[PDB]
Amino acid sequence: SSSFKAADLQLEMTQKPHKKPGEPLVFGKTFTDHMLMVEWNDKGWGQPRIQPFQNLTLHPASSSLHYSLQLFEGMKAFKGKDQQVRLFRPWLNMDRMLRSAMRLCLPSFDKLELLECIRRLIEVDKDWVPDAAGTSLYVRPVLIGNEPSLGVSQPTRALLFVILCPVGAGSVTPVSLLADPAFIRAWVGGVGNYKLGGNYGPTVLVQQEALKRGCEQVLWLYGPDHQLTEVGTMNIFVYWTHEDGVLELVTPPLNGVILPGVVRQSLLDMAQTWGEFRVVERTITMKQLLRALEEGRVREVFGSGTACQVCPVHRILYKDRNLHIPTMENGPELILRFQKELKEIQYGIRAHEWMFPV
Amino acid sequence: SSFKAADLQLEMTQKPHKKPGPGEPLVFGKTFTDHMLMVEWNDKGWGQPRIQPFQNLTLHPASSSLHYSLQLFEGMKAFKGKDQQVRLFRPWLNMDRMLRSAMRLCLPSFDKLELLECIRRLIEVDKDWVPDAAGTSLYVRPVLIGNEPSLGVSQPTRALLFVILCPVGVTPVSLLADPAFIRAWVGGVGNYKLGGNYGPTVLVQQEALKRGCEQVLWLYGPDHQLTEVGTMNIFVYWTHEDGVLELVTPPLNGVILPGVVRQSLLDMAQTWGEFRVVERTITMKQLLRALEEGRVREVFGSGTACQVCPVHRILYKDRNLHIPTMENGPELILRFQKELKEIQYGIRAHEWMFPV
Ligand SMILES: N#Cc1cnn2c(=O)cc(Cc3ccccc3)[nH]c12
Ligand SMILES: N#Cc1cnn2c(=O)cc(Cc3ccccc3)[nH]c12
Numbered sequence: 001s002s003s004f005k006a007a008d009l010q011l012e013m014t015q016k017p018h019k020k021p022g023e024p025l026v027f028g029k030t031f032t033d034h035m036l037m038v039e040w041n042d043k044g045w046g047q048p049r050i051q052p053f054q055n056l057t058l059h060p061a062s063s064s065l066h067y068s069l070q071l072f073e074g075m076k077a078f079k080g081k082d083q084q085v086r087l088f089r090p091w092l093n094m095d096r097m098l099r100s101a102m103r104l105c106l107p108s109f110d111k112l113e114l115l116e117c118i119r120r121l122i123e124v125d126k127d128w129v130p131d132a133a134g135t136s137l138y139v140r141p142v143l144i145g146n147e148p149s150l151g152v153s154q155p156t157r158a159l160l161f162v163i164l165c166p167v168g169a170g171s172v173t174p175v176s177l178l179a180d181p182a183f184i185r186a187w188v189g190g191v192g193n194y195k196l197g198g199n200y201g202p203t204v205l206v207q208q209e210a211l212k213r214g215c216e217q218v219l220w221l222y223g224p225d226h227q228l229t230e231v232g233t234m235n236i237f238v239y240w241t242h243e244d245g246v247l248e249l250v251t252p253p254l255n256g257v258i259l260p261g262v263v264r265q266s267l268l269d270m271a272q273t274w275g276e277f278r279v280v281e282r283t284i285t286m287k288q289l290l291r292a293l294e295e296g297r298v299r300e301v302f303g304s305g306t307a308c309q310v311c312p313v314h315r316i317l318y319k320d321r322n323l324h325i326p327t328m329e330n331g332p333e334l335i336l337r338f339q340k341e342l343k344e345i346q347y348g349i350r351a352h353e354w355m356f357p358v
Numbered sequence: 359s360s361f362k363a364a365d366l367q368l369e370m371t372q373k374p375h376k377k378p379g380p381g382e383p384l385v386f387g388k389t390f391t392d393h394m395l396m397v398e399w400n401d402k403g404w405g406q407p408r409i410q411p412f413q414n415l416t417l418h419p420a421s422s423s424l425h426y427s428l429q430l431f432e433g434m435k436a437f438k439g440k441d442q443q444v445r446l447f448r449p450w451l452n453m454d455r456m457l458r459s460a461m462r463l464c465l466p467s468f469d470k471l472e473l474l475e476c477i478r479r480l481i482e483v484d485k486d487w488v489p490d491a492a493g494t495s496l497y498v499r500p501v502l503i504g505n506e507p508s509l510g511v512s513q514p515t516r517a518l519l520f521v522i523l524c525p526v527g528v529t530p531v532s533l534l535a536d537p538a539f540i541r542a543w544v545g546g547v548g549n550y551k552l553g554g555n556y557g558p559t560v561l562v563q564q565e566a567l568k569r570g571c572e573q574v575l576w577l578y579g580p581d582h583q584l585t586e587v588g589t590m591n592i593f594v595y596w597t598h599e600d601g602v603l604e605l606v607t608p609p610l611n612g613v614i615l616p617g618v619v620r621q622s623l624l625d626m627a628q629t630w631g632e633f634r635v636v637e638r639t640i641t642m643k644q645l646l647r648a649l650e651e652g653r654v655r656e657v658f659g660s661g662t663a664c665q666v667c668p669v670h671r672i673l674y675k676d677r678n679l680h681i682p683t684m685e686n687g688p689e690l691i692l693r694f695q696k697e698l699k700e701i702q703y704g705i706r707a708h709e710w711m712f713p714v
């Protein structure tokens with residue numbers, strides 16, 4: 001397996017630049033002037049290219065639409081005061097993208113070439129990256145199969161493309177969650193730990209049920225012991241005093257039903273570095289949370305992920321009865337600290353190797 | 359709201375493609391006919407259905423069909439009888455299944471009989487692509503996809519329904535049975551025909567090939583239940599532990615795709631009334647024991663593409679189990695094939711066939 005090369009980039013600037021949006025942006029609805037595109041076939045990878053944001057033209061038998069040979073990434077770029085733009089830990093997104101590619105028998109590529117191409121693309125649309133407090137550029141790489149045939153097999157054609165959305169988003173607002181064991185997001189030996197499109201379509205109906213029932217997100221439970229796995233599209237963390245009397249930050253381990261989040265890892269890294277309390281990757285059950293809540297040992301429950309960064313939870317609707325989560329009562333101190341450090345790093349206030357300059 | 363066949367627009371092709379040569383083999387799903395059906399949906403409701411030349415789709419880069427697998431499909435066959443009459447096999451069931459799939463993915467509802475008529479109209483237009491050599495047919499592939507130009511994970515406000523056709527052209531297969539592989543789970547979506555269920559199986563199928571097997575026998579649960587064979591339902595014909603001769607296939611408890619061929623085989627066998635016909639869990643342990651006790655007669659997969667597919671070998675981890683399907687006729691398999699053929703090619707008129 002060869003790889004496309006960033007040296008071979010082909011650039012084509014738009015003939016009529018689009019009018020940028022300070023006003024209300026909906027997430028993922030406004031895109032920039034350009035996009036990256038690379039084609040793969042039996043002759044390997046073609047030359048990458050930046051081109052005006054434009055429609056895909058696909059054979060109607062394309063395996064991307066019949067058998068979900070499709071995977072994506074999500075990461076952010078932040079514009080610092082000094083008008084410099086930085087990507088947050090992009091190497092980890094490239095790492096995960098490649099593992100996802102392998103799981104779906106899609107073509108391998110060089111993580112650094114893709115990153116260089118993405119850098120080049122963001123450079124070209126530098127000015128779309130906003131700089132108002134708490135804003136960023138969302139980067140959405142995608143790799144889809146494109147075999148024009150109905151056989152369920154390893155494709156001999158593929159498209160890799162990348163589009164960009166400017167986004168907005170410090171009054172951290174807590175959410176309520178529906179926790180219903182009938183809905184299972186992922187299973188051991190499945191593909192829940194890869195960022196494949198097939199993992200997301202089925203959750204749309206589940207999220208609608210959570211809205212009809214007065215909740216804002218889904219808390220995905222797993223196992224007959226009802227383990228807390230994820231919140232919506234976010235990893236979940238619990239800050240509590242554990243059954244053994246020790247203050248800790250816990251998140252479920254990567255046993256196959258958890259998507260390894262970049263924010264998740266970064267929160268673990270940060271907490272470990274501070275050395276101020278126990279940081280552990282351990283299974284969390286509803287039984288354990290209820291008991292900890294009845295003994296007042298829970299301080300904060302929250303989600304982590306690129307879009308929200310850190311999202312507090314204040315209520316869980318479980319077994320038809322509502323559980324209050326005292327997250328906001330506790331500051332939320334941990335949440336606020338995490339947000340501030342990430343913000344200082346992301347907007348270049350503290351220099352840090354996690355940031356990748358555009 | 360629904361599209362109506364009465365409103366169909368027809369655009370005939372100006373560039374007809376050459377039909378498959380007489381000395382050229384039809385590889386499954388690579389050759390398409392000249393026309394396709396196309397129906398779009400948005401906040402205004404369903405647009406007009408069109409039969410139009412086979413052509414590429416134009417998709418926004420953010421299309422939810424490509425990021426969050428808002429996609430489902432179907433698979434059914436049209437058969438040309440000696441009288442040159444083309445007929446669809448139990449299409450109402452595919453239409454039923456397609457709508458359930460759509461509901462599961464918050465994709466727009468449509469009228470089943472309206473789509474069936476549009477599909478009939480489409481096949482009528484391309485009727486000369488329907489082959490007539492024995493064991494040949496026309497594969498019909500309806501597809502419904504969300505098409506929201508937005509990265510939000512939510513109910514799409516636009517969708518695209520299309521149908522394409524492929525002309526398509528009892529030798530036993532070996533199966534890899536390894537509990538490491540899971541196709542579906544209770545509380546998942548294995549019982550719907552959604553694109554997301556198939557992509558993850560490509561690597562597993564490569565693993566079966568590497569290990570010298572032709573298909574994957576999908577196992578589920580601590581007790582290693584036999585669920586499906588590749589993209590087919592699985593059936594076992596044996597003398598059960600209570601000494602009774604039966605045809606068993608797994609029940610529809612969430613991890614099984616309700617196949618049309620499967621339902622048809624249950625219906626036929628129930629009608630005969632010559633042996634016990636049941637839907638029940640089947641475990642590797644039950645199979646292993648029945649094999650050493652010489653109780654297994656035939657094991658086979660069922661599905662639209664193969665109809666009935668015999669199994670001769672199962673590689674369970676490292677044990678190679680011989681399945682005596684072919685040493686037993688295979689009597690039931692042949693019987694099913696013979697009866698299906700009579701119904702499908704119009705030899706014997708039947709309510710299961712829908713005339714085109
Ligand atoms: N973080 C976060 C978050 C909360 N809602 N939300 C959304 O509703 C959508 C996204 C984008 C996304 C991220 C990962 C997988 C699929 C889609 N992110 C988020
Ligand atoms: N029957 C059958 C059979 C055996 N192999 N096979 C294939 O390799 C492909 C198909 C078409 C199909 C059917 C259902 C889901 C996805 C694809 N069918 C079959």
Ligand SMILES: *Cc1c(COP(=O)(O)O)cnc(C)c1O
Nearest residue numbers: 233234235259261262263305306
């Ligand atoms: C993308 C994703 C996350 C979080 O990922 P980040 O890399 O932190 O943005 C968590 N859970 C699921 C299910 C996801 O798809």
Ligand SMILES: *Cc1c(COP(=O)(O)O)cnc(C)c1O
Nearest residue numbers: 589590591615617618619661662
């Ligand atoms: C389509 C399908 C079947 C069988 O379907 P028929 O309706 O009989 O063609 C069985 N299993 C799986 C996994 C399928 O996708």
Ligand SMILES: [Cl-]
Nearest residue numbers: 089091092354
């Ligand atoms: Cl990093």
Ligand SMILES: [Cl-]
Nearest residue numbers: 193254256260
């Ligand atoms: Cl992992």
Ligand SMILES: [Cl-]
Nearest residue numbers: 448450451710
């Ligand atoms: Cl019927």
Ligand SMILES: [Cl-]
Nearest residue numbers: 549610612616
């Ligand atoms: Cl069912």
